[PDB]
């Protein structure tokens with residue numbers, strides 16, 4: 001770096017294991033000389049609901065509200081709510097977007113789901129047609145750093161939870177790839193709450209160490225075969 | 231039937247295709263004599279964020295906030311916010327829970343993701359142990375009624391989106407089966423915006439017609455093989 005990174009962070013507690021993973025990511029990428037910005041969604045009280053308040057001024061069809069159409073037209077006419085445009089500018093500038101979050105129901109916490117729903121709008125993140133490899137965020141990298149309650153053994157193809165790759169599909173493929181991102185391999189820190197004080201220190205250190213050489217990684221082939229196949 | 235149904239509905243616009251599918255479900259299950267309740271999350275301005283405002287009493291650990299630990303303890307103590315217990319009463323009474331929503335990033339809209347995050351807490355919907363076939367909502371049925379932008383061709387194993395069942399996994403397996411529901415086959419209404427007025431009417435009618443015999447259906451085998459094959 002010479003590189004800009006955005007960390008989109010979704011945890012309530014600065015003292016949490018997620019808070020420690022976000023802080024070491026800021027510490028290490030800052031040390032390397034990278035430009036670093038963090039969107040701390042709970043501290044921002046980030047609005048998750050997709051509503052007509054996301055368009056300023058007058059609606060494109062006030063009779064029948066269509067969120068997708070309204071947001072697409074508002075984006076083209078620079079008429080989105082400023083909380084959304086502020087995130088868009090951070091994404092537009094970033095070379096890498098890291099998402100740091102605890103797994104909630106095999107997915108992102110709703111506050112982070114709402115960041116994907118509201119910030120990655122038509123006209124900004126993709127066009128129709130104009131998605132997956134034609135997506136408007138091509139050239140950028142993305143990485144999921146997730147923590148779980150379930151153990152690694154529970155997250156195997158024949159464990160109770162299935163392979164972790166099975167829950168990544170909607171986030172890596174349906175969201176990040178659809179927008180044109182190249183996807184770096186996920187960082188999955190399994191079951192930190194029932195690990196010891198060491199162990200948790202270890203996982204934090206492994207993430208710091210990985211970040212040392214993050215710019216030398218190639219992306220995954222974000223395919224059904226990678227997620228589901230043999 | 232002789233049965234109670236809760237419809238958890240996530241669409242901003244009553245005149246929408248989702249709105250029509252929600253209304254026809256209420257119409258047909260009412261006509262059958264069933265007891266029917268709808269949680270219209272956007273009309274309720276349903277809170278999606280998992281925060282410390284969801285607990286009203288003394289926290290177990292006021293120094294380091296852990297949402298899971300504090301909501302489990304608050305469920306037991308009856309100190310959860312009333313919007314969450316209002317939803318829990320609806321679920322507790324229901325024999326079948328239908329989720330009606332447009333697909334957002336291969337998942338539920340954030341407002342609905344927040345209902346899952348905040349309503350299905352430990353102690354209410356599962357315990358550890360007490361999950362998957364031992365989950366606390368055993369005996370209840372759930373059904374996802376989803377609408378998409380992508381066509382059915384795009385949601386096939388060789389199409390750009392992958393098979394439709396791939397995105398269902400975090401919802402049907404990671405959430406509904408984990409809480410002990412038996413899951414009925416999803417209702418997927420593909421690409422209503424693309425379709426003719428006649429084809430849209432046909433999709434609404436197919437859902438109404440299916441609901442006529444819903445109580446005779448068996449659940450799917452909510453397994454990795456059913457979602458992913460081989």
Ligand SMILES: Cc1cc2nc3c(=O)[nH]c(=O)nc-3n(C[C@H](O)[C@H](O)[C@H](O)COP(=O)(O)OP(=O)(O)OC[C@H]3O[C@@H](n4cnc5c(N)ncnc54)[C@H](O)[C@@H]3O)c2cc1C
Pocket residue numbers: 011015016017018019020101102103104105106107147148149150151192193194197200201204280296297298347348404
């Ligand atoms: C609504 C909801 C839904 C969920 N759904 C799922 C799901 O579908 N699947 C699933 O597997 N799990 C699920 N979980 C559990 C959740 O993913 C895990 O609880 C979460 O990932 C744990 O991460 P955390 O940062 O909150 O842990 P924390 O409790 O913050 O940390 C774990 C321990 O690490 C300590 N710590 C903090 N910083 C450091 C450091 N630098 N070094 C060492 N230790 C440190 C803390 O003091 C603590 O003792 C769910 C939880 C909730 C609330």
Ligand SMILES: Cc1cc2nc3c(=O)[nH]c(=O)nc-3n(C[C@H](O)[C@H](O)[C@H](O)COP(=O)(O)OP(=O)(O)OC[C@H]3O[C@@H](n4cnc5c(N)ncnc54)[C@H](O)[C@@H]3O)c2cc1C
Pocket residue numbers: 050066067068117118174241245246247248249250331332333334335336337377378379380381422423427430431434
């Ligand atoms: C944030 C966001 C993320 C999304 N992510 C994805 C995704 O990952 N994958 C994906 O495939 N799609 C995605 N979509 C597209 C979304 O799933 C579809 O736009 C939504 O499913 C369409 O449903 P609707 O009810 O909003 O449609 P509507 O626009 O209401 O329905 C189309 C038409 O049906 C008409 N209609 C209403 N009622 C009836 C009736 N009774 N009979 C006949 N016609 C009727 C309406 O008047 C309208 O003209 C996304 C959209 C947004 C906004």
Ligand SMILES: CN1C(=O)c2cc(C(N)=O)nc3c(N)c(Cl)c(N)c1c23
Pocket residue numbers: 104105148149150151154161298350351352358408
């Ligand atoms: C605390 N906690 C866990 O440890 C854990 C493990 C798993 C799993 N392996 O699927 N899932 C959950 C889940 N859905 C919720 Cl809401 C939760 N609060 C919790 C877990």
Ligand SMILES: CN1C(=O)c2cc(C(N)=O)nc3c(N)c(Cl)c(N)c1c23
Pocket residue numbers: 068120121122128178335378379380381384391
């Ligand atoms: C409007 N719209 C679509 O028709 C459509 C289809 C597909 C898809 N994967 O097939 N995905 C999306 C998507 N992620 C967004 Cl945000 C959206 N606004 C939209 C679609």
Ligand SMILES: [Zn+2]
Pocket residue numbers: 172173174177178221222223224
């Ligand atoms: Zn992909």
Ligand SMILES: [Zn+2]
Pocket residue numbers: 402403404407451452453
């Ligand atoms: Zn299952």
